Amino acid sequence: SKSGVPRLLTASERERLEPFIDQIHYSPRYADDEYEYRHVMLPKAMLKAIPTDYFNPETGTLRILQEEEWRGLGITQSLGWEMYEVHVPEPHILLFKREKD
Amino acid sequence: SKSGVPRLLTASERERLEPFIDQIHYSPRYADDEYEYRHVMLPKAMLKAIPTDYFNPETGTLRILQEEEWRGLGITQSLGWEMYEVHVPEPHILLFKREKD
């Protein structure tokens, strides 16, 4: 399997994101025992302006970006945050659950 | 949006699943505060024998099956289990987390 290499945006690429930056939404933080979480919602129009190599072709979503990469997109947050993704099981794996009594 | 209707397998459809039934793997159960969980792994060859209307075309995975539907596929478990799916965020939503100190 071959995967994309992390890469910083060029001046022209970054300039293209300007009209969307002020429209980025940051959710309030929520947490569990050992982690804090939050999600960032980009305007849908912004995705068409992001370089294709920033996307995972298999998932259709953005690949896990390193800090320099997401900050480079115009996403601003405090320190410590790391991007993560939900992992969906392959089609041959089924998930079940039942209430405990 | 239009979605698939639950539907039981016909005699011929069910007969086609026979060579795979004994190869289905059931994971041990794990749990949290209010739920028990487990995952079932079907042999990959079995997916090609399952009716196309049992799949979600948007996800590529099986749609949430009702009890009669999954038991009808040859999946045998005790009582209480309900099929569930992981929900992946749309491409414009990014997830972040950081360790609490």
Curated annotation (Swiss-Prot), chains A, B:
GO MF annotation list: cyclin-dependent protein serine/threonine kinase activator activity; histone binding; protein kinase binding; protein-containing complex binding; ubiquitin binding; zinc ion binding
Single GO BP term: regulation of mitotic cell cycle
Keyword Cell division in record: yes
Function: Binds to the catalytic subunit of the cyclin dependent kinase (cdc2) and is essential for its biological function.
UniProt-recorded name of the protein: Cyclin-dependent kinases regulatory subunit
Alphabetical keyword list: Cell cycle, Cell division
Family: Belongs to the CKS family.
Disulfides per UniProt: none
Recorded name of the encoding gene: suc1
InterPro entries: Cyclin-dep_kinase_reg-sub (IPR000789), Cyclin-dep_kinase_reg-sub_sf (IPR036858)
Gene Ontology CC, one term: nucleus
Pfam family, one: CKS
Quaternary structure annotation from Swiss-Prot or TrEMBL: Homodimer (in presence of zinc).
